[PDB]
């Protein structure tokens, strides 16, 4: 067929001209698949070998089943991503290769009950949870500081404040510092079509502060869309679990005390107001250290300031170059 080869060259010429175009948005995956073995790829031999929890930077539009995108790997190539509707077609192929996919058990029972597949055997049913295969994400995952204790205190707010002095100096003109006043741990997506849409409903959600949350969330989407990082100073997030289920999924930059014994020595050197909060400060520290290592992306446990700055700077420099 001449058409398949002609459209392949036509797509490649479109791919070649797409290396100098602005980035629109990004997507997040949660399932393992190979994009080269699929027969629906517009370009053959240039598929994507992505895995679970992989981020793709979609810039332009191609069709309703494939989207042009780029990975986060250094020196990568422009690839294609199946659409959630297209992913819905390829996921049905996985469960059809087995003996059965619906209700009828095939335990040596053939020829008596044909059992045509009902609606429960398809994706129309099973809508109690309906986890979305693809979650839309900003251009880059935000970087935030978590721990080692309750935010806002003299010991904790001041220590993380010292980091942002170095981050701004090194990354002038490419990152921005923003103070997140509103809460972020209550970012829900599958609660309602538009909770608290109007301020005159006089409802429990409408009159509360839930409405303000979405304004800050959309502010993050816009600022991150400009291909620039975001620096946040929210004082209501103390554990990584409060953002793992969130569709934002920021990078967890971990700062920790080397030993719990020396941690309480820090509080005793500040002032009488701090030892009053030392009782609750220690309780949060223990609940944070035993978090799984895979929940942390950046670590900062050195006792020296210089090694603390360059550990984050190297990762930021790598991430900045990663998207290009």
């Amino acid at each position: 067929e001449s058409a398949r080869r002609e459209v392949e060259s036509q797509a490649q010429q479109q791919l070649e001209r797409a290396k100098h175009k602005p980035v629109a948005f990004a997507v997040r995956t949660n399932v393992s698949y190979c994009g080269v073995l699929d027969e629906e790829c517009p370009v053959q031999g240039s598929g994507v070998n992505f895995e679970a929890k992989d981020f793709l930077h979609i810039k332009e539009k191609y069709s309703n089943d494939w989207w042009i995108g780029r990975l986060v790997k250094e020196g990568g190539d422009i690839a294609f991503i199946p659409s959630p509707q297209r992913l819905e077609s390829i996921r049905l192929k996985q469960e059809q290769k087995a003996r059965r996919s619906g209700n009828p058990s095939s335990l040596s029972d053939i020829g008596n009950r044909r059992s045509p597949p009902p609606s429960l055997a398809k994706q129309k049913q099973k809508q109690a949870e309906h986890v979305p295969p693809y979650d839309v994400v900003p251009s880059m995952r935000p970087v935030v500081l978590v721990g080692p204790s309750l935010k806002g205190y003299e010991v904790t707010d001041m220590m993380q404040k010292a980091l942002f002095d170095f981050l701004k100096h090194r990354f002038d003109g490419r990152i921005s510092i923003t103070r997140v006043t509103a809460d972020l741990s209550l970012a829900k997506r599958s609660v309602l079509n538009n909770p608290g849409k109007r301020t005159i409903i006089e409802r429990s959600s409408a009159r509360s502060s839930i409405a303000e949350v979405q304004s800050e969330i959309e502010r993050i989407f816009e600022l991150a869309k400009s291909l620039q990082l975001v620096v946040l100073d929210a004082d209501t997030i103390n554990h990584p679990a409060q953002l793992a289920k969130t569709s934002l999924a920021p990078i967890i930059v971990f700062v920790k005390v080397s030993s719990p014994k020396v941690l309480q020595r820090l509080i005793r050197s500040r002032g009488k107001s701090q030892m009053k909060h030392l009782t609750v400060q220690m309780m949060a520290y223990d609940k944070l250290v035993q978090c799984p290592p895979e929940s942390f992306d950046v670590i900062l446990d050195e006792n020296q300031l210089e090694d603390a700055c360059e550990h984050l700077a190297e990762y930021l420099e790598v991430y900045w170059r990663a998207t290009h």
């Binding site: 001041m158 220590m159 010292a162 002095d165 005390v257 820090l266 006792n303 020296q304 603390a308």
Partner: peptide
């Protein structure tokens, strides 16, 4: 681990 966690944590504003 205390000497670093006493100056760096304090050199910012104090």
């Amino acid at each position: 681990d205390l000497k670093g966690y006493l100056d760096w944590i304090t050199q910012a504003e104090d």
